[PDB]
Amino acid sequence: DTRFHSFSFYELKNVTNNFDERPISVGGNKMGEGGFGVVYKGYVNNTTVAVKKLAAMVDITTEELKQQFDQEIKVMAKCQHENLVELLGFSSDGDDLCLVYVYMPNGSLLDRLSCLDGTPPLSWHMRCKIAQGAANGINFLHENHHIHRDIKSANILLDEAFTAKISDFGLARATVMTSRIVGTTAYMAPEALRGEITPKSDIYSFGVVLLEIITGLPAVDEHREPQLLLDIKEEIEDEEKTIEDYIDKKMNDADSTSVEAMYSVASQCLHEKKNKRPDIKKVQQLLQEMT
Amino acid sequence: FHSFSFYELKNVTNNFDERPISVGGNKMGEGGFGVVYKGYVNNTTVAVKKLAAMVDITTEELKQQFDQEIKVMAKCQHENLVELLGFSSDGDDLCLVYVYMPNGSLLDRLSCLDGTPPLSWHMRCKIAQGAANGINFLHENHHIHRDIKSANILLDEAFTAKISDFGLARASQTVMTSRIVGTTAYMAPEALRGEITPKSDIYSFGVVLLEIITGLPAVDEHREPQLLLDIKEEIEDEEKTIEDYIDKKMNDADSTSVEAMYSVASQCLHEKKNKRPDIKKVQQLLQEMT
Amino acid sequence: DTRFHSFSFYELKNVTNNFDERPISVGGNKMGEGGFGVVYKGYVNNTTVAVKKLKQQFDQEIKVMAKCQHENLVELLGFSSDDLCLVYVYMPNGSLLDRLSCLDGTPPLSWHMRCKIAQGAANGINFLHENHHIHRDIKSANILLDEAFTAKISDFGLARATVMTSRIVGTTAYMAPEALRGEITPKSDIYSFGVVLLEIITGLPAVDEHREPQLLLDIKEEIEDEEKTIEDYIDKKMNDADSTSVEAMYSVASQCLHEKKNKRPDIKKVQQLLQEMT
Amino acid sequence: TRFHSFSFYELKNVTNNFDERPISVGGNKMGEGGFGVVYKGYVNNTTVAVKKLAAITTEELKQQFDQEIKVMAKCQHENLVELLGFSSDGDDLCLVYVYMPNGSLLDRLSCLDGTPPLSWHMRCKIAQGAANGINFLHENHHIHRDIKSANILLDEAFTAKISDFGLARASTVMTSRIVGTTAYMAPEALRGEITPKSDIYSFGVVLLEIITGLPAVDEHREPQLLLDIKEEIEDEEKTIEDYIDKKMNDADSTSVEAMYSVASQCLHEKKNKRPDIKKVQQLLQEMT
Ligand SMILES: CC(C)(O)[C@H](F)CN1Cc2cc(NC(=O)c3cnn4cccnc34)c(N3CCOCC3)cc2C1=O
Ligand SMILES: CC(C)(O)[C@H](F)CN1Cc2cc(NC(=O)c3cnn4cccnc34)c(N3CCOCC3)cc2C1=O
Ligand SMILES: CC(C)(O)[C@H](F)CN1Cc2cc(NC(=O)c3cnn4cccnc34)c(N3CCOCC3)cc2C1=O
Ligand SMILES: CC(C)(O)[C@H](F)CN1Cc2cc(NC(=O)c3cnn4cccnc34)c(N3CCOCC3)cc2C1=O
């Protein structure tokens, strides 16, 4: 189990231009945000890093944010894999709790699918590699008895070779129930919205991610019919649509056979009955057979 | 223009090969009056449109549109207009042959069809300028286009905008027609009533400018609002801002020039045709924007 | 417009941002120069114009440009004498010389566009010769291109209404042997047009001090003495050239470049040959 | 790693039996290099580039094929070409890659086939991307030995991809068989030594090609070697402004001077006075 480097809060402040909140495109250091903090670009010990300065951006407490900080370090100390983000160190000495990670040059899958800031669209070849890599990451977590609990495309990061790296382990748990229902509702399994804690919920959320990969559509869009991307499964099932109607137009290399194979995995992951969903090993196998 | 035999164009296009060019076929796209294919004629890359009534028009109307397109192209040459090279009319088939546009349509570049990189704000400004220059040329030369839409604004190797599709064009006192033809999502209210006026080209150009700002198609059945022109009323009623709709697939869009393009779009979209700017005013406003 | 406009020097100073010498590509007003003046971009009455800030050649240019109005000649719109200025209709695509060099990032001209430009330039020379005028300075810097890439012949300061002269004028790299010796004849305009045709085929300027051979017209000899072929020199910046029409244009250029002025085609034959080419 | 083994028969189907007509007229040939001819094709709906290797001796060529596969198995990066597969059946050797829609940097700088001149903004991004690719190779202890603009490929968005790893070496050593393209080679590489410092020198020549739009060598030009403009500028007989590519309209003087300073540093006659690739990346990052 990994022992991590302790960074001085002031060194992190220095290397992020005092946690410069302007976007990196403008000339600032802000890379993005999530429900549990703001991520900044840093340059420490001769290397570009990602610095997450923790902050309750969702309806959670100071103590809950501290328990998630501790949980994230514990998960990162136990879990190292080609398809998981790597923690370099942390800071707990100064004004705010910080986590320092190996920099992900291509940001999140969510942003690459939306082509945020004008980045070029991901090819079908790249999308297949990403789906396989994300499934491999989840498989490693599940094999090592960890439940992610927050699988979403904003938490699947992309490195210098567009290798998928699962991130955000603050809610991870190493069938039981909870009184604090947490997560992004557009991705959550029905049993997760009720408070159940199970690896089968990670599978369902991964099915939503696969629909995002196929369609390039966000999981929720208030101004779209259906508002929830997971509802396209019923549209296709009740023959009012085909996956061809929803395929992202921003690729030139997709083929109907492998797109239908990825859709079939997603459809299976999205079974409303948790016990009827494939386990991650079956997901991995089906995605390997796809290519 | 070169008069080809239909069989020569069958050879050029690999028998109008229906597979997309993206996978080594010849098909490039379709429209209301035919399907366009890629080909090579004497080492020149060309676009070949094989005419077909794909919308509700007669075969006699299609032949009239073919004759009209050739007439307009014989009279009108300008860097912001497509260039016709030839045609075929032998037998029961009609084809038009054009200089190939390596970047296809603005509609497809805005949707990043086939995985093309999203257009920068700087490029979008030059394309809006070029398209206005093309419409100005047509109006200066007493022609009403009647089919202004982003599928009809093509882009060459340097993203120079080229107005295309002249089959419905009319020589230009507002006249009326009994045959209402066009793409509903871009049409001015008076055009939907059958009026023929260059003021309607301005309106349709306003819709194009909203597509340029937002990256959204003029119509989407599974979207609220279904019609992109409806965002003007949303912004006017203050329930939304242009910032809420700006294309997020660019990082070089300054608030000032975006608001300046939106103001030209808003003016073009005036419900009352006589209150819209003319194309010369649209040109000067887009020139002042940059 | 239907009239020539007499402009005050103050108005032309104003519309050119005080004859701003910085090139237009950087935000100034300078568009080009060489020979008898600097040309600036101006904006008069919501219209872009070209303003040439420069005496005999000034009066001659106004005189010849008022008499010679044709679709393939540049259009004079006004003047200023109260520095001497000539005001012309703006040519949005600048010179053929600059478009062949892709100056300022413009895309290479296609072979199709190059054929249309060659035809247009020959039609302009035909109008001048039909109207008993000798250009005397035919070169790609003097072939301008409008908003439709229509060829417009420019620079009429040296133009003349076979005689010999004491003042040998013109651009050396384009000049016929007899023109270099003082002869004033339209047959020399044909020779210079042949050099332009080699520039169009090859995309190479007539002279390049940092190139071997420095002079483009020598290529005719390299090809004739079978040391090279027209294929070795075809501009690689085109994707639509075909061997047949390139050989046809080269043949016209070779005929234009006959060392013996009487063996050269006249402008009407040049027009006919370029018409048969396409 | 997992590279797909194609039969030569499948690759004939992919390339229309290696159709030698150029792609600009509807054929499959895209260009040649010192070790093979590259063809366009499709594997299902995927556009690919297929290099059919051709002569050096057959064993030397086979070694280069083997070395290419090993480098590609170990090195995956957005600024490196991506190998999809190969064919090694019979007496034919093919390498199959992800297609690069904008071809080579050398061809885009020359505007081959009528492509528009690259803007200064695009040239800056390409220089940075190419430096990122070289950095990744050097971090992975590989010396390229053949850095040149013909080996810097460009995708649909003009992302720079380093290619051709047949001559790459693992990591100062000396060699009897001197390989590379003379116009790009460091003096020490011309004397036979193998060092990643020579990759830096070659990259400096590429930077001069990006600034000027001129090929590294032109037998019908004065000076013949582009690297010689450095001395002309040093001895004040020419300026950076004199050599800036005139086919650009968006080139600001400050960042052109910043790229030229990087190029000059890379071209240091003394191998040990040259910046390493991390310093080149930092300098190029500061330039924008
Ligand atoms: C192609 C491009 C436009 O130039 C590039 F896209 C710019 N970048 C880099 C980047 C890194 C991130 N992150 C990291 O490098 C990172 C490393 N470990 N880690 C752990 C948790 C969160 N983020 C990270 C995040 N994250 C922000 C927070 O949400 C997730 C994405 C975003 C971005 C971004 O936009
Ligand atoms: C992805 C890419 C490589 O970057 C590029 F996008 C591929 N291309 C080229 C292209 C040319 C077109 N067309 C022409 O070349 C053309 C020339 N004159 N003309 C006149 C009418 C219609 N089309 C044309 C059309 N048109 C098809 C019909 O609808 C309009 C767009 C579409 C495309 C296309 O997708
Ligand atoms: C596509 C583009 C890059 O944006 C464009 F190329 C910019 N422009 C416009 C332009 C007009 C010129 N000229 C005219 O408009 C003009 C009109 N009549 N006239 C008569 C003599 C000289 N010039 C002219 C000249 N000339 C300057 C003098 O030398 C010849 C070229 C140069 C340029 C130029 O670079
Ligand atoms: C004009 C245009 C439409 O804009 C475009 F330019 C056309 N294209 C595409 C292209 C791809 C290449 N290559 C590849 O796609 C490629 C992919 N991996 N790879 C690895 C080694 C060599 N080539 C490749 C090469 N290469 C040929 C061999 O020399 C290097 C350049 C050249 C070209 C070319 O001219």
Whether residue B53 contacts residue B33, with contact meaning beta carbons closer than 8 Å, is answered with yes
**D170-193 residues labelled b (16+ CB within 10 A) or e (exposed):** eeeeeeeeebbbebbbbebbeeeb
In the structure, do chain C and chain A come into contact, i.e. share 3 or more CB pairs under 8 Å?
no
Whether residue D16 contacts residue D22, with contact meaning beta carbons closer than 8 Å, is answered with no
- Distance, in Å, from the CA atom of B133 to the CA atom of C92, rounded to the nearest integer, reads 12
Header resolution in angstroms: 1.7
**B113-131 residues labelled b (16+ CB within 10 A) or e (exposed):** bbbbbbbbbbbbbbbbbbb
CA angle C193, D220, D150 (to 5 degrees): 110
Task: Tell me the two tokens of residue B139.
Answer: 């109006």
Backbone angles phi, psi at B36, to 5 degrees: -110, 135
Q: To which residue do tokens 């903090």 refer?
A: A37
Q: What secondary structure letter does DSSP report for A48? A: E
Task: Tell me the two tokens of residue A190.
Answer: 């029905």
The DSSP string of D166-204 is: TT-EE--EE-SS--S-GGG--HHHHTTEE-HHHHHHHHH
Backbone angles phi, psi at A268, to 5 degrees: -70, -40
Query: Exposed, middle or buried: residue C265 (CB in 10 Å: 0-12, 13-18, 19+)?
Result: middle
The DSSP string of C31-96 is: EE--SS-EEEEEEETTEEEEEEE--HHHHHHHHHHHH---TTB--EEEEE----EEEEE--TT-BH
Query: Exposed, middle or buried: residue B176 (CB in 10 Å: 0-12, 13-18, 19+)?
Result: exposed
Whether residue C79 contacts residue D90, with contact meaning beta carbons closer than 8 Å, is answered with no
Q: Check pocket membership of B36 for ligand 2, CB cut-off 6 A.
A: yes
Q: Check pocket membership of C214 for ligand 3, CB cut-off 6 A.
A: no
Residue C170 three-state SS? coil
Whether residue C217 contacts residue C199, with contact meaning beta carbons closer than 8 Å, is answered with no
- Intra-chain end-to-end CA distance of chain B, in Å: 38
The DSSP string of C230-267 is: HHHHS-TT-S---HHHHHHHHHHHHHHT-SSGGGSPPH
B18, B23, B28, B94, best to mutate for ligand 2 pocket (most atoms within 8 Å of CB): B28
- Distance, in Å, from the CA atom of A24 to the CA atom of A32, rounded to the nearest integer, reads 9
Residue A197 three-state SS? strand
CB contact under 8 A, A121 and B115: yes
Annotation-wise, does B243 bind a ligand? no
- Intra-chain end-to-end CA distance of chain C, in Å: 34
Nearest Cα of chain B lies from the Cα of C222 at a distance, in angstroms, of: 27
CB contact under 8 A, A253 and D46: yes
How far is CA B172 from each of CA A174, B133, B142, rounded to the nearest angstrom? Answer: 76, 18, 5
D146 is catalytic: yes
Q: What secondary structure letter does DSSP report for B98? A: E
Residues in chain D: 288
Query: Exposed, middle or buried: residue B92 (CB in 10 Å: 0-12, 13-18, 19+)?
Result: exposed
**D194-232 residues labelled b (16+ CB within 10 A) or e (exposed):** bbbbbbbbbbbbbbbbbbbbbbbbbeeeeeeebbebbee
Residue A184 three-state SS? coil
- Distance, in Å, from the CA atom of D210 to the CA atom of D121, rounded to the nearest integer, reads 11
State the sign of the Cα–Cα–Cα–Cα dihedral A155, A159, A162, A166. negative
Query: Exposed, middle or buried: residue C31 (CB in 10 Å: 0-12, 13-18, 19+)?
Result: buried
Whether residue C50 contacts residue C91, with contact meaning beta carbons closer than 8 Å, is answered with yes
Considering only CB atoms, which chain C residues are within 8 Å of D245?
A: none
Q: Which residues pair with D225 in a beta bridge?
A: D217
**A121-160 residues labelled b (16+ CB within 10 A) or e (exposed):** bbbbbbbbbbbbbbbbbbbbbbeeebbbbbbbbbbbbbbb
Whether residue B86 contacts residue B4, with contact meaning beta carbons closer than 8 Å, is answered with yes
User: Which stretches within C131-266 are classed as H helix?
Assistant: 177-180, 186-202, 219-224, 230-233, 243-256
Angle at which helices C186-202 and C111-130 cross, to 10°: 170
Task: Tell me the two tokens of residue A97.
Answer: 């709790």
A4, A16, A36, A104, best to mutate for ligand 1 pocket (most atoms within 8 Å of CB): A104
Whether residue A154 contacts residue A218, with contact meaning beta carbons closer than 8 Å, is answered with no
Whether residue D61 contacts residue D35, with contact meaning beta carbons closer than 8 Å, is answered with yes
Task: Tell me the two tokens of residue B259.
Answer: 């608001």
CB atoms closer than 10 angstroms to residue C56: 8
What method was applied to determine this entry? X-ray
CB atoms closer than 10 angstroms to residue C22: 11
Considering only CB atoms, which chain A residues are within 8 Å of B224?
A: 223-225
Task: Tell me the two tokens of residue A244.
Answer: 């061809």
Q: To which residue do tokens 């590699």 refer?
A: A129
Considering only CB atoms, which chain B residues are within 8 Å of D25?
A: 40, 43
Q: To which residue do tokens 């923790």 refer?
A: A54
Binding-site sequence positions of D? 30-38, 51, 148-151, 164
Whether residue D274 contacts residue D246, with contact meaning beta carbons closer than 8 Å, is answered with no
Backbone angles phi, psi at A109, to 5 degrees: -60, -40
Nearest Cα of chain A lies from the Cα of B128 at a distance, in angstroms, of: 19
- Nearest one of A113, A134, A124 to A218, comparing CA atoms: A113
- Intra-chain end-to-end CA distance of chain D, in Å: 36
CA angle B15, B21, B23 (to 5 degrees): 110
- Distance, in Å, from the CA atom of B259 to the CA atom of B253, rounded to the nearest integer, reads 10
Annotation-wise, does B39 bind a ligand? no
Q: Which ligand minimizes its atom distance to the CA of C98?
A: 3
Q: To which residue do tokens 């790296």 refer?
A: A165
Q: Check pocket membership of B39 for ligand 2, CB cut-off 6 A.
A: no
- Distance, in Å, from the CA atom of B149 to the CA atom of B180, rounded to the nearest integer, reads 16
Considering only CB atoms, which chain D residues are within 8 Å of B116?
A: 156
Nearest Cα of chain C lies from the Cα of D97 at a distance, in angstroms, of: 25
Q: What secondary structure letter does DSSP report for B229? A: G
Residue B46 three-state SS? strand
Instruction: Considering the candidates D19, D89, D146, D276, report the single residue annotated as catalytic.
Output: D146
Whether residue A103 contacts residue A96, with contact meaning beta carbons closer than 8 Å, is answered with no
SS percent in chain D: helix, strand, coil, step 5: 45, 20, 40
Tell me which chain D residue has its CA closest to the CA of residue C210. D222
User: How does strand B161-163 pair with strand B143-144?
Assistant: unpaired
Q: Which amino acid is at A200?
A: K
- Nearest one of B161, B159, B163 to B144, comparing CA atoms: B163
Residues contacting D78, CB < 8 A, separation 6+? A105, A106, A160, A161, A162, D129, D132, D159, D161
Cα pseudo-dihedral D184, D190, D194, D196, rounded to 10: -30
Nearest CB to A118 within list B111, B115, B120: B120
Q: What secondary structure letter does DSSP report for B125? A: H
How far is CA A7 from each of CA A17, C181, D49, rounded to the nearest angstrom? Answer: 16, 84, 47
Q: Which ligand minimizes its atom distance to the CA of C52?
A: 3
- Distance, in Å, from the CA atom of C40 to the CA atom of C87, rounded to the nearest integer, reads 10
Q: From atom 7 of ligand 2, which residue's Cα is the shortest distance away?
A: B104
Binding-site sequence positions of C? 31-39, 52, 139-142, 155
- Distance, in Å, from the CA atom of C46 to the CA atom of C66, rounded to the nearest integer, reads 24
State the sign of the Cα–Cα–Cα–Cα dihedral A93, A95, A99, A103. negative
- Distance, in Å, from the CA atom of D130 to the CA atom of D210, rounded to the nearest integer, reads 12
Q: How far is the CA of B283 from the centre of ligand 3 (A)?
A: 21
- Distance, in Å, from the CA atom of D43 to the CA atom of D51, rounded to the nearest integer, reads 14
Tell me which chain C residue has its CA closest to the CA of residue B280. C46
Task: Tell me the two tokens of residue A70.
Answer: 């501790």
Annotation-wise, does B249 bind a ligand? no
Considering only CB atoms, which chain A residues are within 8 Å of D47?
A: 252-253
Q: From atom 2 of ligand 1, which residue's Cα is the shortest distance away?
A: A106
Residues contacting B285, CB < 8 A, separation 6+? B260, B263, B264, B267, B277
Q: To which residue do tokens 């990082």 refer?
A: B251
CA angle D51, D55, D59 (to 5 degrees): 100
User: Which stretches within chain D are classed as H helix?
Assistant: 8-14, 58-74, 105-110, 120-139, 187-190, 196-212, 229-234, 240-243, 253-266, 277-287
Task: Tell me the two tokens of residue D276.
Answer: 């390493």
How far is CA D152 from each of CA D81, D107, D207, rounded to the nearest angstrom? Answer: 9, 10, 12
Q: Which amino acid is at B235?
A: I
Backbone angles phi, psi at B96, to 5 degrees: -125, 135
Nearest CB to C242 within list B42, B77, B79: B42
State which ligand 1 atom lies nearest to the alpha carbon of A106: 6
Residues contacting C113, CB < 8 A, separation 6+? C149
CA angle B169, B172, B176 (to 5 degrees): 80
- Nearest one of B135, B175, B131 to B153, comparing CA atoms: B131
Instruction: Sketch the domain layout of chain A as residue ranges.
Output: 1-291
- Distance, in Å, from the CA atom of B123 to the CA atom of D44, rounded to the nearest integer, reads 33
Largest CA distance in chain B: 58
Q: From atom 25 of ligand 2, which residue's Cα is the shortest distance away?
A: B104
Whether residue A165 contacts residue A85, with contact meaning beta carbons closer than 8 Å, is answered with yes
- Distance, in Å, from the CA atom of B4 to the CA atom of C44, rounded to the nearest integer, reads 46
Q: Which ligand minimizes its atom distance to the CA of D33?
A: 4
The residues of B that are catalytic are 147
Tell me which chain B residue has its CA closest to the CA of residue C112. B44
- Distance, in Å, from the CA atom of B27 to the CA atom of B29, rounded to the nearest integer, reads 6
Provide the phi-psi class of A46: left if phi over 0, else alpha when psi is between -120 and 50, else beta: left
- Intra-chain end-to-end CA distance of chain A, in Å: 35
Q: Check pocket membership of C153 for ligand 3, CB cut-off 6 A.
A: no
Task: Tell me the two tokens of residue C12.
Answer: 């032309």
- Nearest one of C100, C126, C103 to C197, comparing CA atoms: C100
Cα pseudo-dihedral A191, A193, A198, A204, rounded to 10: 80
Backbone angles phi, psi at A51, to 5 degrees: -115, 115
In the structure, do chain D and chain A come into contact, i.e. share 3 or more CB pairs under 8 Å?
yes
